[PDB]
Symmetry: C5
Subunit: 342 residues, 5 copies
């Protein structure tokens, strides 16, 4: 009897056809699909893509599946039965490849309401290639988008609509080590025009903000320290050229290395990153320090002690100048990027 009902509803009997669209030659089937995202992982600037595995819940009703037989409002069909019924055909457009998880049983959940409402749920792993603007790199906000489109049928045949309440849910305990996701999530329609015809698509937005802890600790602090080293360099007498030339050279080299280190993590990009203007100014200051020492030597290795007194003056006034120029730059710098954002 219970098997007999799976056989009666879905059997060849009643002439049910998998291939034919529900309510065919008529109003477009409306699919309400909401996604529950388990995790973001392996977000890489260089690879340019981010991994997310999601439950996809799509709901479409067809009149023909509706049954008067059982008391229960919704009956849970077997996962295999699902291969038999018509399914809405939905591919991630930017998907860059994706896979089901078939571990143990195939992971799929389907249930038919007596009304004829169908609930269909699948667990997918997605790699998604999102374009991301690095115009200001360290502290930027990046938007990651996923758009679900129907490759099979045109606009008149099929439509996608987000669920009116709670269209995208996130894991209760989900955190990203590198970025923080924002509670506010934008959802917006799109319509794709292709040579073949117009295909429906719906896209979610995700907003992610870069954690400043790691970059502060790694990128900025050593720069600050190295810049301190020039400052301590100034106090040593000009008579010892090696100590000054040694500090200047060593510091400029280290700044070079520190600068490349930032570059290795990132994808190769034409426009100047904020990190680059920071490195350019730090390097400009150490180079200017060595430059000042060079000028002091040009005056000192030249001649008369009156000039050497002049140079002992420029030493003090310089040592007072550099922390001020660096500090004022720093102040002027932080406001634009980390304050009044967007």
């Amino acid at each position: 009897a219970p098997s007999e009902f799976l056989d009666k509803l879905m059997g060849k009997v009643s002439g049910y056809d998998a291939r034919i669209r529900p309510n065919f030659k008529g109003p477009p089937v409306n699919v309400t699909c909401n996604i529950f995202i388990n995790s973001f992982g392996s977000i890489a600037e260089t690879t340019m893509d981010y991994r997310v595995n999601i439950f996809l819940r799509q709901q479409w009703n067809d009149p023909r599946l509706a049954y008067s037989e059982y008391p229960d409002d919704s009956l849970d069909l077997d996962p295999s039965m699902l291969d038999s019924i018509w399914k809405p055909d939905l591919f991630f457009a930017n998907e860059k490849g994706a896979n089901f998880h078939e571990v143990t049983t195939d992971n799929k959940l389907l249930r038919i309401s007596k009304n004829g409402n169908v609930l269909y749920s699948i667990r997918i792993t997605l790699v998604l290639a999102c374009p991301m603007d690095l115009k200001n790199f360290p502290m930027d906000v990046q938007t990651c988008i996923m758009q679900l489109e129907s490759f099979g049928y045109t606009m008149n045949d099929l439509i996608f609509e987000w669920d009116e309440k709670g269209a995208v849910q996130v894991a209760d305990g989900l955190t990203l080590p590198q970025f923080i996701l924002k509670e506010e999530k934008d959802l917006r329609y799109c319509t794709k025009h292709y040579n073949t015809g117009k295909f429906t698509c719906i896209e979610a937005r995700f907003h992610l903000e870069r954690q400043m802890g790691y970059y502060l600790i790694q990128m900025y602090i050593p720069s600050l320290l190295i810049v301190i080293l020039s400052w301590v360099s100034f106090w040593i007498n000009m008579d010892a050229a090696p100590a000054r030339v040694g500090l200047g050279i060593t510091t400029v080299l280290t700044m070079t290395t520190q600068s490349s280190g930032s570059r290795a993590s990132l994808p190769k990009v034409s426009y100047v990153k904020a990190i680059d203007i920071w490195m350019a100014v730090c390097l400009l200051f150490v180079f200017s320090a060595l430059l000042e020492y060079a000028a002091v030597n040009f005056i000192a290795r030249a001649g008369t002690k009156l000039f050497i007194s002049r140079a002992k003056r420029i030493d003090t006034v310089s040592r007072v100048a550099f922390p001020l120029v660096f500090l004022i730059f720093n102040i002027f710098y932080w406001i634009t990027y980390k304050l009044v954002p967007r």
Copy 2:
């Protein structure tokens, strides 16, 4: 005759249906599942996931499979027969992808007791994404969790229960090169609430403790050595500025490199790692050493021999001071992290 019994029990005859849940429209099927874990491998902080391949043994009884025909209490069915019978549908929630091992035969073991108890065993390889807190990195205890949930049916239909005795077993000879697993294993229920309904889950806990041998040998000892180099630097006369500036610079650079080296292995993280406070203090001491030499020079390059005597005093008192401040820091440091843990 023996084939005739596989054909009689599992045949179309008797109207056995694969798709229908055992004891349908009634008390939820109870699955007692215990796992035997062959190995942990490729645990990587950066990838954030750990590999484990496990035997999964799940036991559920259904009345309809029960047979009075044979003398034997448990009969071992063919591995293919398994595709025909109803199986409890169980997916690892955090699985991040997983695969069966089909090498030679498909690796699956099933047996039916005359009572109707079914024993079902499969060999799976799992990658598992466990969130791990690095708040104190080198010596931390990390908890790795795996939760088994039923994607197919709600709470009223199906339930998972760990076996009362020996729910998780480990290989007799299993060792992890990086961590040690703890004999005490916590097992605790969870219930998942999703928009679709409430799904049963059961989760194991694994506790892993970081081996301090490698990090002691690699991370800490070279730091100690480099800090010794400042100490030997102090004894050289202040008259030779290059030897002192050379030692100070070289040591601070090496400390910088040593510090980055720790960072390369780890995933990028916002909160300060214990290794970082260690590096910060070591670097602070070498920098303070160079700083003291700079002050000594400010007094020395300045003027009168009374001051130079003053500086020869500060040399000795400093050389006595640094091992004490470093030693007291070290003592104060170890207690918090490696003593009175958690």
Copy 3:
């Protein structure tokens, strides 16, 4: 009735055979295929290949599929039905491996016009091995080619023709981080002669131009800076040999490192890259600077003050000479590669 038409047109009835070519033993089937390319990604010089995922739209008409039954000009058949009809067999020749995207439904779109025109669309991910000439590396234009050939039948049986209008389309918002694609796209026939017979092929051209921003910021500027360091080195008195030897050595070493850094990204290649002539000249200038200092010392460590005056002359005239020789080289250099291209 609607199922009955899928059954009538494609049924065993009417004796339709999948295996037989349309209009068999006659004029070669003509396939008009246009591709819509979603993205280029992971273009790597070292791996030598570039990833592109494309929609492939191929159109061939066969008389036998044509139907008089429906009012609609084009009817959209089910994606599975596609396995039944004869398909033009088309493999990417240089494909180096490729995969369909079967996520959710298999992603395939097919429709039959009453005329008998068939539209067939598939979404594919391609890795493509394109040979690329590095003769001038940093600023080069690279051509990436994909050729679609029929492995199954000879020229007399089958032919490929690009669509007369809009044979290749690109995503409206598509950008490549490393290169820019050019609007002008060349399309040209090819015919392959193999021992078996002659097979049709059609190949698209893509032209890509290297972004000069990243290489300017990374490769060239540090070179400029390091070359500046020699210039500042000259001013320090020759009396201090260490400062001069220190600057010369340090700079030549850094130039060595900078040079290798360029090499690591690129595939190993026999012919000299433009970047290499740039590095060779920069290194030649720093080496020549140190060389001049060495000559100055050979005169200076030798003897009489008249010679030392001679050397103080060569210092000034040299410091005036080096920026001129470097600047004139730079000017002479840029014209060939970034100006009057091809």
Copy 4:
């Protein structure tokens, strides 16, 4: 007729059942299986696993397959026929994943003797995770083990036995770039006890010895050279502090780098590697050299020429001492690890 015999022996006729074990409800089936190993490849200490692809030849007789029809002692059945007959189910326990090679035809060889002896051969690629002890790393002997167990049936049902003569064969021309395999091969039974029951297993042993050429050339020689540099450092007068401090520092730094270099290849391990005691002693000697120079300076920068004469004595006696202490250490070192092994 020849097809008729495949149809008669393996047909539904005679009531042959694939699922049922040979000689069912009786003495355990005995499988004699010998392996021919094509190659070892990609043996990596860090990944901890080694690749081997093997032919597996397993022989079990069943009475029912035996035929009186043909003259030939052994008849070669079609590779597909193999799917129909019962196969012994054998999975590599530590397999960590493995794959068949299906290129061209599926690669499988089966033949049935009239006696009823069945020869079954398959070509498999295995990744095998072998635990390996690094207690003395550079020159160690490592044992790699593969154990073949039956996941399907208990001890009473099935048994594995190595072939009495030539159970494991190796390719005639097989060589490993990193290790050498030893002709003597140990083969030993194991029995696995699991909660389900006792399962048969048979394990091969492979013994591999590390090639000392590469590590001698790479690891040890540069250490020797750097240690020579301290020796040449001693001869330079103590009056020039920079040359001595320069050599001491530079050499200790280089030793640090050389030491890390060894570490990068290896998996992270708690226990001290032999390479580490070697590095510790080399570094101890360079550090002791710099230390002696520091003491000499403490005496020299202090005061009276009688002390400076004392120091010129300690220079000579030291320069005589260091090659002796290093040489005697070297001698004492090599004996334990490369002599009287195990």
Copy 5:
């Protein structure tokens, strides 16, 4: 009618059996197979394997497929039909894994001549593990071999023969960035003896020669340059110890780094590479230069000006000596490896 002929020739009618070998119980089937290689790619010394994707064309005639029905000499069967006919079973022995390309249609080409000659063509991607001798690394000739063997049947059943004319063809435009392939190609039989029996194999030879451009530009030139730096070092007066010690140390360090750099690309190997003798001699010369400076100091820091004159003599005679010893070594070196090869 045309379908009726596929049904008549290959139908169950006429009692055609896929499983049975052509001309069974008789003279061994003779397969003439020629390969057309599209590309070599990703040849890596470290991975030890090289990728090649090839068309495999194998020709065997069977009497039973021969038909008198059509006028055409050769008829092209459908790619699926191929699964039905008997195929020669041919696996690459060293294949290390390989895959078909199933993109769009499965890529397979088959045609049956009325004579009964069958032409069968498949497109395969192969990874091939070739053993390669590095005894002289930079400029070596390496032979890469692929051997095609029949795993299914013995010598008496099946045989492989290369096509008498043009057995291996190469792409008209094929080039390898790292090596050049030689027009002369050796083809030679092999017979494999295994415990099971004797299996036929045929192997192609490929000869590849290393491009000297990249290694000249990268490996050798910087060595030459660094060796020049010692030469320029000699001219500086011995009075400044730091400039000489600085140049000697810096150069020996850089030589160390340059030496390791070569090692990173290559697989770990016991026997001494030619590149190693080159590095050993270069390093020996820089070390000998520093050594000579040390001796000069032992004489100079010692005492009387007559000795200092002696040392100013050894300076000149040395500076004349080193370019000669290095040049004569270079000459003596190149002849063995790049001249009179093999």
